[PDB]
Amino acid sequence: EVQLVESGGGLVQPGGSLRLSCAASGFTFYSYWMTWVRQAPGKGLEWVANIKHDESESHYVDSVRGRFTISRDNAKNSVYLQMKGLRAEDTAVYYCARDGGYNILTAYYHAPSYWGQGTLVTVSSASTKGPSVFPLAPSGGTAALGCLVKDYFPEPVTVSWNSGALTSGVHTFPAVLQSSGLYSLSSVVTVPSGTQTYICNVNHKPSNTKVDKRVEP
Amino acid sequence: LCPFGEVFNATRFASVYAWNRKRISNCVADYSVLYNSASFSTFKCYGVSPTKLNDLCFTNVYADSFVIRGDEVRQIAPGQTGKIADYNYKLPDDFTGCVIAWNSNNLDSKVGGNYNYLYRLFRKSNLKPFERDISTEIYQAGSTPCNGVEGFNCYFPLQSYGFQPTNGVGYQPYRVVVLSFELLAPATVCGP
Amino acid sequence: ALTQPASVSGSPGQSITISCTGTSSDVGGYNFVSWYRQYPGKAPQLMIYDVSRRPSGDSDRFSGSKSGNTASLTISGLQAEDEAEYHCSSYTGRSPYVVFGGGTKVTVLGQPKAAPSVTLFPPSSEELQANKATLVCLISDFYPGAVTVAWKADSSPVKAGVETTTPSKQSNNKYAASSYLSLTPEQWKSHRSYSCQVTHEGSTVEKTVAPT
Ligand SMILES: *[C@@H]1O[C@H](CO)[C@@H](O)[C@H](O)[C@H]1NC(C)=O
């Protein structure tokens, strides 16, 4: 069976460097084109680079020209993606794939076929930072009030209401990642429509932040 | 005097997968004249010293000739690996003979690419020494039969050099002649 | 670069069709359309290539065709395990040498369709005092789990400052998402209203909030 074992990746700051590699077995490596594809979170696939079986030809998507270098070591059955000047928009899961290629003689293109398992590249300048917590005031027989847990890093945050006494109608939504590199989430409770006091308890251990916010109309 | 010009000054050369061979026998081979005849960029020998060649006798000599990239002339030798040596033209480990090459960019390149020169890219196994594989059978890389057409795990086995005159020097076309010195039988090819 | 539906749904046993529209220089210019299936956290898997060809029997329920600049993928005999993302792609013969659509989520219906419940919060006054402004649009209880959210200031589309999550499966097997629009306090006070429009299964739900 074909195997493509991906290596490399991880977390860097903007302007940093990475090198991904793919180690092939189960096929005669130096007969095949190799292709790199990336996938940002919640998005589709994007073609990144390709390289001919003999490195005599290699192509790159425009936004990585002069920053990424594709290469291959046929003796080691490996293909590499060298990444410099990394930007936040480069954050993605990166896949190596076999083929992706084009035979001039027959004008035939073989689609990316076998794919590595993917490796995560994260480019971020964010630093640990405790959230600011803002009350989300109310105004189907029920009222929604909540807590905006804004601008923190890294995940996670824990939110409870009335120190765990209120658990019904409580929906804590998963976080957004902002373009600042910081996370935000919201915790909402749906309550019967001035009598009960509602308090959200926000805990961010990485910053040793604890905050209780009273939510009122 | 051996008719080397029939090989070296040939107007057209074969593709390396379809390498041509001329048997040379019953003639005097003068290699100092051959060497000074042209601007060879490679002139190397194996099992013999290049500078003691005019005192040698052999039974026959075979002149194999083809075109490859300058960066692949290094594969035309015993003990070499690579797609050229593995799938196109293979010398035995105990090769006795000389490998000669020269840049042919002025003859073999064409604006917009000369796609006539081909090489083999896929094969089920490596060539034996001096084996010649001209097949164009679709290469079956997986378990599904290819039915003579390209597709998933099914590859046309040949690839074109795209020789353009603007190519880097490693990628320009080089004409290669491999002289094989065979000795089984009375000798029919001697130096002067 | 290629255009495919964000999501399609069908009931178990049915056929569904995913369209993928390109241009004369790709879907319309080659017979090199490929379709990939991708399960969460897994690498894509080639299900169809050369518009209609199957790499293996794993694609026996898949078929492809093409007319003009649109290709189509049909899945027959829909099974629960067909729930996955499907990506179309095409060779272009130029950067990008392979183009993709944005991916289609296939939902195999396992419960009645359900419209999103949408709640929109305006910026806190405490947030305004901190020289910040965030609109919070919470979207819950929809099925299938696919939604598109648009923001409007007054009635004009607002694109900058928008951050919306992928849907996440609730414990009741319906889905939830949230979208954020960050603004300056002045931007917030200088419009008459802001709206969060959530489109689901061709029907749109809108909440509007105003400064007070
Ligand atoms: C090819 O022609 C040149 C010019 O006449 C001559 O010097 C050379 O020896 C010829 N080639 C061979 C191998 O004799």
Numbering used by the authors:
A (entry chain H): 1 to 139, 145 to 198, 202 to 225
B (entry chain C): 335 to 518, 520 to 527
C (entry chain L): 1 to 212
The authors write:
As the density of the RBD-NIV-10 interface was unclear from the cryo-EM analysis because of the flexibility of the spike, the epitope of NIV-10 was identified using the structure of the complex with RBD via X-ray crystallography at 2.2 Å resolution. Finally, the heavy chain of NIV-10 bound to the neck part of RBD, with the CDR-H3 targeting the left shoulder from the back side. L105, located at the tip of CDR-H3, was bound to the hydrophobic pocket formed by L452, F490, and L492. The CDR-H3 of NIV-10 also recognized the area surrounding the F486 of the RBD together with the light chain, which overlapped with the NIV-11 and NIV-13 epitopes. F486 was located close to the hydrophobic environment of the light chain (L46, Y49, and P55). N487 and Y489 formed hydrogen bonds with the heavy chain. Y489 also had π-π stacking interactions with the Y32 and H110 of the heavy chain. The F486 recognition modes of NIV-10 and NIV-11 were structurally different, and NIV-10 had more space around F486 than NIV-11, possibly accounting for the NIV-10 tolerability to F486 mutations. In contrast, the G485 of the RBD formed hydrogen bonds with the NIV-10 light chain Y49 and heavy chain H110. Taken together, NIV-10 had a broader epitope area than NIV-11 and NIV-13, possibly accounting for its resilience to viral escape.
As the vulnerable sites, we focused on ACE2-binding sites in the receptor-binding domain (namely receptor-binding site, RBS), which have pivotal functions in viral entry into host cells. The structures of the SARS-CoV-2 spike protein complexes with NIV-8, NIV-10, NIV-11, and NIV-13 Fab were determined using cryo-electron microscopy (cryo-EM).
